[PDB]
Amino acid sequence: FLSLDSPTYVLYRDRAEWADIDPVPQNDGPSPVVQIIYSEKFRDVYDYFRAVLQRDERSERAFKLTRDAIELNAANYTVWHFRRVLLRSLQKDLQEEMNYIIAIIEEQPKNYQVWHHRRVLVEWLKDPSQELEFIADILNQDAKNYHAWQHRQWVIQEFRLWDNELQYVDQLLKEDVRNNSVWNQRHFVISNTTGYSDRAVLEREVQYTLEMIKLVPHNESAWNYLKGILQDRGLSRYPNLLNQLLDLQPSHSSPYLIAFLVDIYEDMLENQCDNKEDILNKALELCEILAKEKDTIRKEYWRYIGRSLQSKHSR
Amino acid sequence: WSEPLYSLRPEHARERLQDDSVETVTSIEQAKVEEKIQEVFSSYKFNHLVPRLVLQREKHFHYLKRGLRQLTDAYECLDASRPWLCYWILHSLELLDEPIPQIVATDVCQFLELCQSPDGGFGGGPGQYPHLAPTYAAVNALCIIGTEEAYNVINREKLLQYLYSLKQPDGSFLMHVGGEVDVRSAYCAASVASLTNIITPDLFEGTAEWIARCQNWEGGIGGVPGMEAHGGYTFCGLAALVILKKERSLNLKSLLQWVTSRQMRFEGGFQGRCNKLVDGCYSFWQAGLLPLLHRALHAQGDPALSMSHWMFHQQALQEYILMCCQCPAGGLLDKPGKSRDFYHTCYCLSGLSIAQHFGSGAMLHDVVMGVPENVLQPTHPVYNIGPDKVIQATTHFLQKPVPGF
Numbered sequence: 001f002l003s004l005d006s007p008t009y010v011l012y013r014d015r016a017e018w019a020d021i022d023p024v025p026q027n028d029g030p031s032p033v034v035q036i037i038y039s040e041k042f043r044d045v046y047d048y049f050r051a052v053l054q055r056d057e058r059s060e061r062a063f064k065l066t067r068d069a070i071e072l073n074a075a076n077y078t079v080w081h082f083r084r085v086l087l088r089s090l091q092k093d094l095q096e097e098m099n100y101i102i103a104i105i106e107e108q109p110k111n112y113q114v115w116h117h118r119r120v121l122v123e124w125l126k127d128p129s130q131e132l133e134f135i136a137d138i139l140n141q142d143a144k145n146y147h148a149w150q151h152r153q154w155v156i157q158e159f160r161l162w163d164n165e166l167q168y169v170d171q172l173l174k175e176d177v178r179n180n181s182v183w184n185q186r187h188f189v190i191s192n193t194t195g196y197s198d199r200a201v202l203e204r205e206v207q208y209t210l211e212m213i214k215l216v217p218h219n220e221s222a223w224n225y226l227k228g229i230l231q232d233r234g235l236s237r238y239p240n241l242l243n244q245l246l247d248l249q250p251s252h253s254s255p256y257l258i259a260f261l262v263d264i265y266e267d268m269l270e271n272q273c274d275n276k277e278d279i280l281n282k283a284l285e286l287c288e289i290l291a292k293e294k295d296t297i298r299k300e301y302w303r304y305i306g307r308s309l310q311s312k313h314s315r
Numbered sequence: 316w317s318e319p320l321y322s323l324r325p326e327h328a329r330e331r332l333q334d335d336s337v338e339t340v341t342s343i344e345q346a347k348v349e350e351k352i353q354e355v356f357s358s359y360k361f362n363h364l365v366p367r368l369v370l371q372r373e374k375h376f377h378y379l380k381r382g383l384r385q386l387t388d389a390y391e392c393l394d395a396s397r398p399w400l401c402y403w404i405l406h407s408l409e410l411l412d413e414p415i416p417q418i419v420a421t422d423v424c425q426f427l428e429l430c431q432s433p434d435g436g437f438g439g440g441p442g443q444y445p446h447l448a449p450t451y452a453a454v455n456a457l458c459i460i461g462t463e464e465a466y467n468v469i470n471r472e473k474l475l476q477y478l479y480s481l482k483q484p485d486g487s488f489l490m491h492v493g494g495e496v497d498v499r500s501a502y503c504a505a506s507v508a509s510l511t512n513i514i515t516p517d518l519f520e521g522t523a524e525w526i527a528r529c530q531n532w533e534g535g536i537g538g539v540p541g542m543e544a545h546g547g548y549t550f551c552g553l554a555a556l557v558i559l560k561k562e563r564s565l566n567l568k569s570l571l572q573w574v575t576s577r578q579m580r581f582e583g584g585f586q587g588r589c590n591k592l593v594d595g596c597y598s599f600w601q602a603g604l605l606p607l608l609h610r611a612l613h614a615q616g617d618p619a620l621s622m623s624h625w626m627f628h629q630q631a632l633q634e635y636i637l638m639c640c641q642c643p644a645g646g647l648l649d650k651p652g653k654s655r656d657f658y659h660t661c662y663c664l665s666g667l668s669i670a671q672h673f674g675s676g677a678m679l680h681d682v683v684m685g686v687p688e689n690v691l692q693p694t695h696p697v698y699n700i701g702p703d704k705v706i707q708a709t710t711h712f713l714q715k716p717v718p719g720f
C-alpha cells in the first residue's frame with residue numbers, strides 16, 4: 001500500500017494507525033558487539049516488527065509490515081515465519097501471495113528464504129502449474145542459479161513432470177554447452193526416467209558427449225559427463241573407447257583427454273588385463289606429462305596417481 | 316634469471332583459456348576474469364618494480380578490530396547473521412595471532428547469550444528464532460574465546476532438544492523449525508554436537524547415509540540429492556562425515572579427482588563449481604577438503620600419500636590470495652574489483668593458513684610464500700577454529716555427561 005521507495009513514505013512512528021502500539025527497541029545490551037548502524041527507515045520498521053512479534057499480533061497491518069521488513073532484509077527468516085503464520089491466520093489469498101513471491105524472486109534470485117517460501121506455497125496450494133515456466137524465466141537471466149535448479153528438481157520430482165525436461169536440457173546446452181548446471185540436469189532426468197543401462201540410451205548419450213567434445217575439446221563438462229556415465233560399470237568394459245580417444249589426439253588434445261586415458265588404463269590394470277606392464281607404462285608416462293608439462297597446477301595429484309599405480313601394479 | 320613466483324613465469328601464459336573458437340557466456344566471462352588477473356600478475360613488469368608478497372596484517376587487524384564493535388548499514392543484510400560476524404571476525408583475529416581483550420571476550424559472550432533461544436540453539440540476533448547456521452557460528456565463536464564464561468553460555472540440554480526437533484526420518488536435518496533441509500545443516504549439527512559432547516547414539520542415525528546420497532556423478536557433493544556438485548556443500552558433507560567417522564560412506568577417489576580439478580590452471584585460486592569463476596572464499600571450502608581427504612585416505616593405509624604437501628598447488632593458491640584478494644585498505648575479497656567484507660576476510664585467511672601448513676602424524680612441513688611474517692596460525696580443517704581451541708573445548712565438555720546419559 002505504501003511502498004518503501006515512494007516519495008511519500010512515512011516512518012511507522014509517524015503513522016496514526018500505529019499510535020496504539022509502542023515500538024520495541026533492539027535489545028543489544030549495555031556493551032554491543034558487531035552493532036549495525038542501521039538506517040532510520042530500517043530501524044523504524046524492525047522496532048515495529050518486534051512489537052507485533054512480541055504481542056503476536058495477527059493483524060492485516062502486521063502483514064503489510066512483514067512485507068517492508070522483508071524488503072529491507074529478505075534473509076530474515078524470523079520475519080518470513082511470522083508472515084507464514086499470518087498467511088494462515090488471516091486466510092490470505094495464496095494466489096496473490098504467489099504473485100508477490102514471483103516479484104521478489106525476480107529481484108533477489110540468490111536468497112534461500114524466498115525460494116523456500118515459494119515451495120511452501122506450492123505445497124499448500126498443490127499447484128505446480130506455473131513453476132516450470134517461472135523457473136525458466138529466472139534461468140533465462142542466470143542460467144546457473146543454484147536455488148533455481150534446486151527448485152526445478154524439487155518440482156519435477158514431487159509432481160512427476162519429467163516428460164519435457166530433456167528437451168529443455170537440450171535447448172540450454174545449445175545456448176551454452178559449458179553450463180555444468182545443465183549437464184547435471186541432463187543426468188538427473190535420464191537417471192530418473194530411462195536410466196543409463198538401456199544400451200540404446202547409453203549409446204546415444206556417449207555419441208552426444210563425444211560429439212560435443214569434438215566441437216569444443218577444452219570444455220570440461222562434457223568430459224566429466226562422459227566419465228560420469230561410463231565409470232559406473234568400469235571403463236575397461238568398453239574396449240573401443242581407448243582407441244577412439246587416441247584418434248582425437250592429433251587434432252583435439254587437451255589435458256582432459258590425457259587424464260581420461262589415465263582412467264581407462266587404471267581400470268584395465270584393476271581388471272587384470274593382457275599386458276600388466278606396457279599399459280602401466282603408458283599410464284605413468286602420461287601422469288608425468290601432466291605433472292611436468294600439461295597440467296602442472298595439479299602436480300601433487302598426478303604425482304600421487306603415478307605413485308598409486310606403481311604401488312599397485314608392478315610387484 | 317628465474318622467477319620465484321609461479322604465476323609470473325613465462326610458461327604460465329599457456330595456462331590461459333582456450334575457447335576452441337566457440338564462445339559462450341561461460342567463456343566470455345572466464346576470459347574477462349583472466350584478463351583482470353593477468354593485469355594484476357603483469358603489473359610488476361609494467362611498473363618496473365621487483366615483486367614481493369606481503370600479507371598486510373596491520374591493515375587487516377584495524378578493519379577487524381573496528382568491525383567487531385561496529386558496522387555500517389551495508390551490513391543491514393546480515394542483521395539475521397550476527398553470530399556469523401562474531402565468528403568470521405574472531406577467527407580472522409585468531410589466525411592473525413591477535414589476543415582478544417577480556418573485556419571484548421565478555422561482551423561477545425553476553426551478546427551470544429542474548430541470541431540464545433530458550434528452547435535451545437541460537438538465532439541471528441537478539442530475539443530472533445534459532446537456526447542451525449548461527450548456532451554453529453555462536454558455538455565456534457565461543458570456543459575461539461575458550462574461557463569458562465564462554466563455555467558456560469551454551470545450554471547443552473536445550474541444544475540437544477533443539478537438534479532432535481530438527482532431525483528427520485530419512486537421516487537429514489532441518490536448518491530451522493519449518494525451514495528446509497540440506498547438507499549444510501548436517502555439518503552444522505555434527506559440529507556443535509561433537510564440540511559440546513551431546514552426541515547420543517541415535518542422534519545421527521541415517522545422517523551419513525543421507526550425506527552419501529548427495530555425492531553425484533561429478534564426484535563432489537550437492538546440497539540435496541540430485542543437485543550439482545558444489546565446493547561449500549562438499550566441504551560440509553565430508554567434514555560431517557569425518558566427525559561422524561564414516562568417511563568411508565563416500566567414493567573418496569572420485570571426490571579427490573573433483574576437488575583437485577576445481578583449482579584454476581591460470582588464477583591459482585579455486586572455483587566453487589565446474590565451469591564457474593574463481594573466488595577467494597573457496598580457498599577454504601575447496602582447499603580445506605584436501606587435509607580432510609589426506610587424513611581419511613591415511614586412515615586406510617594409502618601408502619602413496621605425500622608426507623610434505625597437500626594434494627593441490629599450495630604455492631599458487633597463496634599467490635592468488637596475496638596478489639588478487641587483498642584490499643589495500645584492509646580486509647580481503649572474492650576477486651579483484653569486488654569489495655571487501657568480513658566473510659571473505661575470514662575464508663581467504665583460513666585458506667591461506669591451510670596452504671601454508673601441512674601436518675600428517677609427526678610430519679609437519681610449511682610453505683610460506685612471500686615474506687616470512689606472512690605465516691598464519693594453523694586452523695582445524697573440520698571446524699575452522701584453531702586446533703588448540705578444538706582440544707581445549709572437547710576436553711572441557713568431555714568432563715560432563717551426554718545429557719540423558
Ligand SMILES: COc1ccc(S(=O)(=O)N2Cc3cc(C#N)ccc3N(Cc3cncn3C)C[C@H]2Cc2ccc(OC(=O)NCc3ccccc3)cc2)cc1
Pocket residue numbers: 075077392395396397399438439446448449594596649656657658659
Ligand atoms: C549480495 O550480498 C550478499 C551478502 C550476504 C550473503 S550470504 O549470507 O548468503 N553468505 C555470506 C556472505 C557474506 C558476506 C559478508 N560479509 C559476503 C558474501 C556472502 N555470500 C555471497 C558471496 C560469497 N562469495 C561470493 N558471493 C556472491 C555467500 C553466502 C554463503 C553462505 C554463508 C553462510 C551460509 O549459512 C547461512 O545460513 N547463512 C545465512 C544465515 C546466517 C545466519 C542466520 C540465518 C541465515 C550460507 C551461505 C549473500 C550475498
Ligand SMILES: CC(C)=CCC/C(C)=C/CC/C(C)=C/COP(=O)(O)OP(=O)(O)O
Pocket residue numbers: 110144145146147448499502503545546547548551586587588591592594600
Ligand atoms: C552453513 C555453512 C558452513 C555454509 C557454507 C557452505 C556454502 C559456501 C554454501 C553456498 C551454497 C550456494 C547457494 C552456492 C551458490 O553459488 P553462487 O551461484 O553464489 O556462485 P558460485 O559460482 O561461486 O557457486
Ligand SMILES: [Zn+2]
Pocket residue numbers: 594595596597649659
Ligand atoms: Zn566468495
